Write a protein that binds this ligand. Structure first.
Ligand SMILES: *[C@@H]1O[C@H](CO)[C@@H](O[C@@H]2O[C@H](CO)[C@@H](O[C@@H]3O[C@H](CO[C@H]4O[C@H](CO)[C@@H](O)[C@H](O)[C@@H]4O)[C@@H](O)[C@H](O[C@H]4O[C@H](CO)[C@@H](O)[C@H](O)[C@@H]4O[C@H]4O[C@H](CO)[C@@H](O)[C@H](O)[C@@H]4O)[C@@H]3O)[C@H](O)[C@H]2NC(C)=O)[C@H](O)[C@H]1NC(C)=O
Ligand SMILES: *[C@@H]1O[C@H](CO)[C@@H](O[C@@H]2O[C@H](CO)[C@@H](O)[C@H](O)[C@H]2NC(C)=O)[C@H](O)[C@H]1NC(C)=O
Ligand SMILES: *[C@@H]1O[C@H](CO)[C@@H](O[C@@H]2O[C@H](CO)[C@@H](O)[C@H](O)[C@H]2NC(C)=O)[C@H](O)[C@H]1NC(C)=O
Ligand SMILES: *[C@@H]1O[C@H](CO)[C@@H](O[C@@H]2O[C@H](CO)[C@@H](O)[C@H](O)[C@H]2NC(C)=O)[C@H](O)[C@H]1NC(C)=O
Ligand SMILES: *[C@@H]1O[C@H](CO)[C@@H](O[C@@H]2O[C@H](CO)[C@@H](O)[C@H](O)[C@H]2NC(C)=O)[C@H](O)[C@H]1NC(C)=O
Ligand SMILES: *[C@@H]1O[C@H](CO)[C@@H](O)[C@H](O)[C@H]1NC(C)=O
Ligand SMILES: *[C@@H]1O[C@H](CO)[C@@H](O)[C@H](O)[C@H]1NC(C)=O
Ligand SMILES: *[C@@H]1O[C@H](CO)[C@@H](O)[C@H](O)[C@H]1NC(C)=O
Ligand SMILES: [Ca+2]
Ligand SMILES: [Ca+2]
Ligand SMILES: [Ca+2]
Ligand SMILES: [Ca+2]
Ligand SMILES: [Ca+2]
Ligand SMILES: [Mg+2]
Lengths: 593, 359, 117, 115
């Protein structure tokens, strides 16, 4: 609910490059400034002879908004033999998938081809560039002597990547072994240390990988999408992998042991061709200290009352329990052909409520299929199926839908306010848009009546002007508020108190404030956050036995409050929001005797 | 609140009334019976969409016996039977095909047989009364190939269904789209592997009988595929030789109006499959409603000749000649805020209902 | 250019007997096709009667050509292939040739069948 | 029905050139390659050359080079094998053929004798 979608930072790249195809954040251990990583897989590079090679750009944030390419590769195609190219970087889609762990940037080119030593051919093996410190190396775990379709020749390594907290890289290569797919994971230290630019095939010692199986598993694409998290309680992040065509294209998600690759879990979709496993993610969404599993199935068709199938998209959600079992629920999308669940991007605890939150894309939904991103808050019982905030693309299609939400990354605080932010790509228009999270104010609003017992006989005080005696009671209220991140010390609140307003307009209101003979009052309050409740007291009285519709009714005492939103802003103009899971409309009853 | 049934000359033979106009008020309901009465001896348009990747070589050669024999068998089920023909392989992009200059030239490793260049979808023969042309279109058909086993079946089907002016589908006909294969098909999201992230817009993209957006647009989803097949009144018949048949069979519940059968290992039943599939399709009557009217909901139940009742799109079974199926249509209004179309799936005639609201 | 070896060149048969002959190759004839593991072998067998053009019997080292009697069975893989004739007839007295098409086309030596007497 | 019709017998002297024709009928000539095979008088078959009528570009065996040329006359659905500088070892029957598996064909063969 607290994401600022009114003043996002907009970035753009070269036309036709699909700038914004893949997004992540770059956060060096000691730069004191953060950058965004935005891919552009079809970008025209300055490399000698490479067309639409693809690039990854480092984008700034403070001051201006400009992006510059990272020189992972500043050369052309190497030769194998005189007038016989070793490799083909043309249309390699470099920047198609980008991930970063603080300083370490892993950027892949899934469509890279090479000839292999044995004979001339063009195998889509796939390569990645890993940058750390001041050195960059080429990593290509499938570029080996195990070639052709029954080997790793068609691997497309780097198609989907992630990082393991153990400083390992997890690469999904869905084309291995006749598209059975293979996961390969290795150590950063091994990749960087065992590097030689004159060697095409490099062996590593601490490498883990899946293995080829029977033909019945062909065309499953294992390693289509990957994610990590601890699913067995060993302290070692395990490997989560989507396999969209598994089990007769029901789609499956596999979890492999992050230490020895033994299989741990098998999640199977229910509907054929829903493409279950398209996108997978893991996070603790309920505060149980166990990673939970989030699986998209973007083509899922939901049957209506007459059995009619509506293609909407589905996300399967399951919580991990200590016993080793999972508790499964389901979340459906909202719009037809929007492909809800195409991207799952954990936001971390974006609203700072103690639970992690998740953004789920539906890239072809909304007016003109601009694309929609739905934000679902977490809670102790699992992900809340009801979205609290909806984001939409702000650009028209030029040749294809902007596909806003196609790829997203959250849980990184860029504006340094304690509330993690979110980057959303919209590659169809060559753009990327950064949303920042607003501070959240929780308000303790008190309301009391002294005495709550009131009548027409107990006249206790006199009115101003003419000293008529009336039955008097006091109405008190007070406010305290605070947040968890960076908020202005002085909060500006507007409060209005109404007496006996809960009735048909035109009816007589029985309770009035004696200073003005009015059933309503408002005040301008300045409240220091984290301080004392600021209280006020007004004296109310009942109309006498001459001005009424009845004598015995409940009296509603109603308090409404809101933020000013004019002075309520930080140095960048970012305004706080009241917690949307709490009321700002409260009441008490007093009773007439 | 009322229902008006026009007494004007009707322009439908199977579906009547083909036009209904009703008046609703919030909280109101109204209903009527819609009659569906299938004809015997239909004009029939049968288009052969054939998988021509290398594994199909030994089945394709058997299509040379289909023209005249099938025409004779259909003489007892139809009045006017036409044949058409086209073929498909896959998307002509890496990694689905080789892109090496020397391999693409031959498109296979077999130097005995000449393989044709790979293609997405090509239209070969427009639907025609001429049986000889069908047999000739088949006789000169060469075999192609690819690297990946799955095929671009659904992509070719959409173009075959949508490009009406090129295929030559008649409005005055039962439109049959026969898909011949042995392997499973690619799904909409499989194309990411080839670098194709552009959605299929569901339009017609043929030039000189060649589908030219096959390398830039992804495969259609099943949702899109069924939508277009129903909208264009096409009854799909799948003919699958391999164990993959079961893959197709179990997708039938997701593709209303579709039927599938098996091709024998000898491919000796190519004509029997078509005739039997036709006979089963003609006896299955079900309807769906396209409801774009906001605040209005429909509840339709099929009332069968045998006394059973089957709700929604379930419809009635074992329908014959001189046999009416009645559909009980109730419209209920929840709120104030156009028309909706109620049609039998696989039929050329539809009923349009106009829903007025006095608010 | 793949060398084919065919043997024996002189095969003695009698009607009703099971007759076998073999062809071996200097390299694998198994290539990549439309199927994953089920690769095709680029090998075919022909029957040539004296004074006649040769006729195709078997292709891909398995599938029979239409019109071929169901007694001609080809089988094998890699570099070692065979042809077996079940219940050989007196009308099968022809010279058989194997031909590979993995790369440059070439034929084997030829196996001649003659009746035992 | 696919047919291949070849020219009749030729009696040539050493060093002379012979043009052996093969006329195709019953099919789309320009969509298939045509192969030439040599059958020496008493030996097995040896593949000589193929001509891909789609492009007009020939391919020859490593041994059958230089003296052998292949050309097309697509206007009459026919192809030619031209053998230059005939030697005595060229005495053979030369066959034309279609090698498509489901639609093959061999011609009757042309007998060439060299003095
Ligand atoms: C999630 O779901 C996946 C499946 O999608 C599942 O993984 C699969 O596990 C099964 C085993 O349960 C794997 O199948 C085989 O397992 C044997 C292990 O040997 C034991 O079990 C067999 C019975 O299957 C007993 O006979 C034997 O005595 C042991 O008790 C492996 O040995 C098999 O390996 C074969 O493939 C190798 C490829 O390199 C060959 O080298 C090897 O020789 C085997 O080949 C066999 O088949 C050939 C024909 O294809 C034949 O020619 C050979 O002679 C030989 O008979 C094989 O792995 C299955 O492959 C796994 N699938 C995948 C995709 O990994 C997970 O366990 C499950 N996870 C969870 C948590 O539920
Ligand atoms: C990258 O550069 C290529 C080469 O100029 C661009 O592709 C060309 O586009 C023109 C039309 O503007 C065509 O006439 C050429 O034939 C195309 N060439 C090739 C090799 O495709 C490409 O559009 C550029 N891409 C980006 C993102 O700038
Ligand atoms: C049906 O198609 C066949 C095949 O094209 C037609 O027969 C051809 O007729 C032309 C003359 O117009 C001849 O030159 C061809 O040689 C014939 N071909 C064959 C295979 O016979 C036939 O006339 C067509 N019939 C109808 C009613 O359209
Ligand atoms: C739906 O299909 C039917 C059957 O083909 C069409 O009915 C025929 O229309 C033609 C042309 O007017 C007549 O000559 C036939 O006699 C009709 N058949 C019968 C049994 O009456 C019908 O016109 C088509 N309707 C639409 C809306 O396309
Ligand atoms: C079509 O459905 C309507 C109901 O929507 C049927 O009419 C009802 O008949 C029952 C008796 O079985 C009465 O109790 C209801 O009050 C009737 N409702 C209305 C709105 O009239 C109607 O009979 C059905 N028609 C057919 C042919 O089955
Ligand atoms: C992987 O490590 C776990 C540690 O708990 C062990 O139980 C499991 O058997 C190991 N698997 C293999 C294949 O070594
Ligand atoms: C349609 O009518 C049947 C029979 O009364 C009822 O059971 C069903 O719930 C109704 N469906 C809707 C969507 O109103
Ligand atoms: C039902 O269908 C079967 C064929 O499966 C047929 O033999 C039978 O006569 C049909 N019954 C009716 C009542 O039409
Ligand atoms: Ca673990
Ligand atoms: Ca958890
Ligand atoms: Ca939260
Ligand atoms: Ca922030
Ligand atoms: Ca394929
Ligand atoms: Mg195929």
């Amino acid at each position: 609910f607290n994401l600022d979608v009114d003043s996002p930072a907009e970035y753009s790249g070269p036309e036709g490059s699909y700038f914004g195809f893949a997004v992540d954040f770059f956060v060096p251990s000691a730069s004191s400034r953060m950058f965004l990583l935005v891919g552009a897989p079809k970008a025209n590079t300055t490399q000698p002879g490479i067309v639409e090679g693809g690039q990854v750009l480092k984008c700034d944030w403070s001051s201006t908004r400009r992006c510059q390419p990272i020189e992972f590769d500043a050369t052309g195609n190497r030769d194998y033999a005189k007038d016989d190219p070793l490799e083909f970087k043309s249309h390699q889609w470099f920047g198609a998938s980008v991930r970063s762990k603080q300083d370490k940037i892993l950027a892949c080119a899934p469509l890279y081809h090479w000839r292999t030593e044995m004979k001339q051919e063009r195998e889509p093996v796939g390569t990645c560039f890993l940058q750390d410190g001041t050195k960059t190396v080429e990593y290509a775990p499938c570029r080996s002597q195990d070639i052709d379709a029954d080997g790793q020749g068609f691997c497309q390594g780097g198609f989907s990547i992630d990082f393991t907290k153990a400083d390992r890289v997890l690469l999904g290569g869905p084309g291995s072994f006749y598209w059975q797919g293979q996961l390969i994971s290795d150590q950063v230290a091994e990749i960087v240390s065992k590097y030689d630019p004159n060697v095409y095939s490099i062996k590593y010692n601490n490498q883990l990988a899946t293995r080829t199986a029977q033909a019945i598993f062909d065309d499953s694409y294992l390693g289509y999408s990957v994610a990590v998290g601890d699913f067995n309680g060993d302290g070692i992040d395990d490997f989560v992998s989507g396999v969209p065509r598994a089990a007769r294209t029901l789609g499956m998600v596999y979890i492999y042991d992050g230490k020895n690759m033994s299989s741990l879990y098998n999640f199977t979709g229910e509907q054929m061709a829903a493409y279950f496993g398209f996108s997978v993610a893991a996070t603790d969404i309920n505060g149980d200290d166990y990673a939970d599993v989030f699986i998209g199935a973007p083509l899922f068709m939901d049957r209506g009352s007459d059995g009619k199938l509506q293609e909407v998209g589905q996300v399967s959600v399951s919580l991990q329990r200590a016993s080793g079992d999972f508790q499964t629920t389901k979340l459906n999308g909202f719009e037809v052909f929007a492909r809800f669940g195409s991207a799952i991007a954990p936001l971390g605890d974006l609203d700072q409520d103690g639970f992690n939150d998740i953004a789920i894309a539906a890239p072809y939904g909304g007016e003109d299929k601009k694309g929609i991103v739905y934000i679902f808050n977490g809670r102790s019982t699992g992900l809340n199926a009801v979205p609290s905030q909806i984001l939409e693309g702000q650009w028209a299609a030029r040749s294809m839908p902007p596909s806003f939400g196609y790829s997203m990354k959250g849980a990184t605080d860029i504006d340094k306010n304690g509330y993690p932010d979110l980057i959303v790509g919209a590659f169809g228009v060559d753009r990327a848009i950064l949303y920042r999270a607003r501070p959240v104010i929780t308000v303790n609003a008190g309301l009391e009546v002294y005495p709550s017992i009131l009548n027409q006989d107990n006249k206790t005080c006199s009115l101003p002007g003419t000293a008529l005696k009336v039955s008097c009671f006091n109405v008190r209220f007070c406010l305290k508020a605070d947040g968890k991140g960076v908020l202005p010390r002085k909060l500006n609140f507007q409060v209005e108190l109404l007496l006996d307003k809960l009735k048909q307009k035109g009816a007589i209101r029985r309770a009035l404030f004696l200073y003005s003979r009015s059933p309503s009052h408002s005040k301008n309050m300045t409240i220091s956050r984290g301080g004392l409740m600021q209280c006020e007291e007004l004296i109310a009285y009942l109309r006498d036995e001459s001005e009424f519709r009845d004598k015995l009714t409940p009296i509603t005492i109603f308090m409404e409050y809101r933020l000013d939103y004019r002075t309520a802003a930080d140095t960048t103009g970012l305004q706080p929001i009241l917690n949307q899971f709490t009321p700002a409309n409260i009441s008490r009853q007093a009773h007439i005797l | 609140v009322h229902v008006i049934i026009p007494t004007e000359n009707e322009i439908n033979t199977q579906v009547t009334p083909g036009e209904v106009s009703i008046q609703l008020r919030p909280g109101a309901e109204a209903n009527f019976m819609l009659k569906v009465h299938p004809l015997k001896k239909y004009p029939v348009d049968l288009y052969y969409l054939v998988d021509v990747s290398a594994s199909m070589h030994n089945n394709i050669e058997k299509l040379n016996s289909v023209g005249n024999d099938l025409s004779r068998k259909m003489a007892f089920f139809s009045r006017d039977f036409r044949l058409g023909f086209g073929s498909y392989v896959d998307k002509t992009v890496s990694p689905y095909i080789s892109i090496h200059p020397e391999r693409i030239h031959n498109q296979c490793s077999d130097y005995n047989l000449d393989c044709m260049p790979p293609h997405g979808y090509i239209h070969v023969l427009s639907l025609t009364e001429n049986i000889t042309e069908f047999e000739k279109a088949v006789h000169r058909q060469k075999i192609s190939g690819n690297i990946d086993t799955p095929e671009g079946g659904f992509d070719a089907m959409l173009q075959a269904a949508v490009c009406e002016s090129h295929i030559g589908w008649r409005k005055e006909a039962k439109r049959l789209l026969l898909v011949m294969t042995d392997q499973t098909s690619h799904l909409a999201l499989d194309s990411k592997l080839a670098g194709i992230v552009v959605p299929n817009d569901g339009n017609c993209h043929l030039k000189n009988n060649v589908y030219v957006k096959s390398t830039t647009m992804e495969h259609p989803s099943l949702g899109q595929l069924s939508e277009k097949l129903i909208d264009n009144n096409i009854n799909v018949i799948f003919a699958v030789q391999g164990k993959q048949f079961h893959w197709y069979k179990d997708l039938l519940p997701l593709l209303p109006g579709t039927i599938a059968g098996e091709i024998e290992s000898k491919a000796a039943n190519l004509n029997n499959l078509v005739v039997e599939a036709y006979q089963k399709l003609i006896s299955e009557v079900k309807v769906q409603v396209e409801n774009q009217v906001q605040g209005i909901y429909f509840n339709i139940t099929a009332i069968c000749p045998d006394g059973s009742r089957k709700p929604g799109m379930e419809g009635c079974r074992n329908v014959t000649s001189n046999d009416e199926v009645l559909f009980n249509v109730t419209v209920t209004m929840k709120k104030c805020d156009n028309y909706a179309i109620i049609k039998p799936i696989g039929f050329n005639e539809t009923a349009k209902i106009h829903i007025h609201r006095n608010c | 250019d793949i060398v084919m070896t065919q043997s024996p060149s002189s095969l003695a048969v009698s009607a009703g007997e099971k007759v076998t002959m073999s062809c071996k190759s200097s390299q694998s004839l198994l290539g990549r096709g439309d199927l994953g593991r089920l690769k095709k072998n680029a090998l075919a067998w022909y029957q040539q009667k004296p004074g006649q053009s040769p006729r195709l019997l078997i292709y891909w080292a398995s599938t029979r050509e239409s019109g071929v009697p169901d007694r001609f069975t080809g089988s094998g893989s890699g570099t070692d292939f065979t042809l077996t004739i079940s219940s050989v007839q007196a009308e099968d007295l022809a010279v058989y040739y194997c031909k590979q098409s993995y790369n440059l086309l070439s034929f084997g030596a030829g196996t001649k069948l003659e009746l035992k007497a | 029905q696919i047919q291949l019709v070849q020219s009749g017998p030729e009696l040539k002297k050493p060093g002379e050139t012979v043009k052996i024709s093969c006329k195709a009928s019953g099919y789309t000539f320009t969509d298939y390659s045509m192969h030439w095979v040599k059958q020496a008088p008493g030996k097995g078959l040896k593949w000589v050359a193929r001509i891909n009528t789609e492009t007009g570009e020939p391919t020859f065996a490593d041994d059958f080079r230089g003296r052998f040329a292949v050309s097309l006359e697509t206007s009459a659905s026919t192809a030619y094998l031209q053998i230059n500088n005939l030697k005595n070892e060229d005495t053979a029957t030369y066959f034309c053929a279609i090698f498509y598996y489901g639609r093959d064909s061999w011609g009757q063969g042309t007998t060439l004798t060299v003095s």
